Amino acid sequence: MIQGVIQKIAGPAVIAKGMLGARMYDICKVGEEGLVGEIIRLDGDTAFVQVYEDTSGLKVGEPVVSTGLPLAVELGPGMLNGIYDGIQRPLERIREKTGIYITRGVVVHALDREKKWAWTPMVKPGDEVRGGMVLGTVPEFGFTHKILVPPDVRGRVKEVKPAGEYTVEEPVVVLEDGTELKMYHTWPVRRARPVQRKLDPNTPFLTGMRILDVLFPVAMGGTAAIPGPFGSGKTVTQQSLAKWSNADVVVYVGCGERGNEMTDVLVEFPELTDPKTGGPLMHRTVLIANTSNMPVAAREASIYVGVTIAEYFRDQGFSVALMADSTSRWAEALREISSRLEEMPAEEGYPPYLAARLAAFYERAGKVITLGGEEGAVTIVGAVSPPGGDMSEPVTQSTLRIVGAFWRLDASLAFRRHFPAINWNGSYSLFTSALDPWYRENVAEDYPELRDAISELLQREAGLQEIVQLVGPDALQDAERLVIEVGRIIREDFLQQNAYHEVDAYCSMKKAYGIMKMILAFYKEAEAAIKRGVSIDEILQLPVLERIGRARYVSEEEFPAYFEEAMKEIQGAFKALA
Template sequence: MIIGRISRISGPVVNARGMEGIKIRDLVRVGELGLVGEVIEVKGDQVSIQVYEETDGLRVGEPVKSDGKPFLAELGPGLLGMIYDGIQRPLEVIRDQTGNFIARGASGDPLNRERRWHFVPTVKVGTPVAHGDVIGWVQETPAIQHKILVPEGVSGKITKIKEGEYTVDEPVAELDTGQKLYMKQLWPIRRPRPIVQKVAARVPLITGQRIFDVFFPVVKGGSAIVPGPFGSGKTVTQQALAKWSDADIVVYIGCGERGNEMTEVLTEFPHLEDPRTGQPLMNRTVLIANTSNMPVAARETSIYTGITIAEYYRDMGYDVALMADSTSRWAEALREISGRLE
């Protein structure tokens, strides 16, 4: 454990001393309340930290603690249908704890620790496995099978695996190396998930909107931008793409959006019907809400959180539509944070 003391506070940027051995992008807990932050600059034992929560009331001399690990996203069954903030705190869980406003220092498990999933193995004892191999699946929603993958840096032969009911914290398999495999994985959000080969984009994304498919075609694996002034229909366009495109999974990031716009998304998405299955569209959607009145540091991080979740489902073989609304406000957050650095 690395422990230092606050030496300077400038909005969302906090400076601390006595943090020998800490690294860029390490996660820290700031002050008596344990506000979540991330190291963005290191000068000897002095560090600059972007704090993901409001820093009102912090005092010079309060402790700053870190276990030397980066910000890790939790990946596993239970992501679909969830609404998170920019640092993957489950907003519905926190609302039950603190009410309609997020209390500083509030936290919650991104994945439900109590729910039991029916795990069905797809490999047998003695099967050699390595990073990225599928060892089984659980039915995450009526439309989506969640494939359980071997994490990075792990390989060996299966010595124990059994169908049954498990929580995300219980091992579902064991290797000859003694390594236990779980349904849950942790992944640093700043690191892209590894790929074997970058495949040339050839398959079109069928958006379900004829004007887009004819005049503004998009390929799967590609990217597009929807420019326009306030009130021109950008958010409505994204909702139409989420509902009618032929993507399997939708990850929607409200990055710095006005509160009323994000409220509209949060209230309408759960009631949209999936034209494929007739089930709620939320059964294959993850929402990340970080409105303009939330701290700018968390706004900057929300994009990386969403990309990490999208890449995780991509690794299972699903087509994922990632939508960030809006990247201009993401750029505003980057400018504000950089402007407060000495």
């Protein structure tokens, strides 16, 4: 590739000469130390590169070498159980050779070039292959890893490596035109991978949490945002979704978090366990980690590497969930990069194209039919931290227009220690009607009407909050006190789920349906018994209320017996007390 020398150094910008033939946005190696850089200019024989690392100590005359490719990632076996930075460098292998500091100019490989993998072919010589097909399988933890021809390659095969142990560097399939296929291939992070067809959302994404699954559901392949003031509970909720959801592969992105919180999430995760198999949780997750003192170019590319990896695991047919820590810091990094380039800020300090980048990030999520004929889906959950509290912050305003679900958190409900702190008066979801045909054909025919009754009862109680503010709740009417107590029971025994608690952090669908059915039955029978006119004040202290709270902690396998017990207790109380 083209090689040139330096003729100007001014901060992070380096002007090289002799670089005729270099392409825009390529990755260059600058200086004898070998610092990475990106070309953004072309003018005659000279090109302007922008160095990621510190340029102190460089001298005029040091060579510049181009790699000929833009920013890309290595996709292949060995990405699970790994920790990477914003530009896919393994943090564990760097520590082995260097120490507790990250010396600049270090060279490492994303995929371990010296680990043997078991190879099992699935094609024979003489076959015709096209981009996206499957040729070969590799075991990897509890998964089987499929070897894919790159989407831009078509040809005819006459070479098959027989079943044996090989590294990812060894060719396995050689085409008629001389193309050699390996176990890994590169892909630029800012170009979306092709698909056959994009499908409609018709299956729910089971978060395992009662309120998020019932009141504000998100489908498989949807997008959700969870904003709120600092100290609300975003991180624990995202970790709970990572632990208990039905997604096969989980990708976590750290876009510049604080060092101590990054240490917290780096220490906590290896101690977790996979609920599906009982093994370590890290065997199915991929971690992208950045701190505040990393180079600013590595912070901007953090969300693109994660989404490219998620799209790679989508093409193999799995279901992928992509959790992203606060994108406000990613937008701050983008603003700093734009200020480096003098981009005439528009909104507050942000570049005018912030919404385009946010849309390009969120549009990759969906349920598609892959080029190999299989079906895969990607779900994206992102966090926002508006500093002013109000949702008029420009990043929040740009995010609100391209998301389907919106799980707003509130700090005041955290002060009452009611967790999760979901504001049910501000949150909304647009996926309910599409998920309704799935609900009635699988869960229960009466599920949507029961859910609407629960939501209507929650809405009625919010309309009485003015009268409670003037006069005490005891002076209110018996029916109004009834609906207030029903709302309180619904909140404290249906919307509560403690995440630090060991058995309060998960809830299935059948348990929630049974709890809603019991609550509606109790409400209707108590409403009739009030007009019955017997023991109207002692209705609030019936022994059935113990059975309502007991269903929160009953096991799923023991759930039908306790459901029958609670229903027949409701019958024996309301029918035959008086």
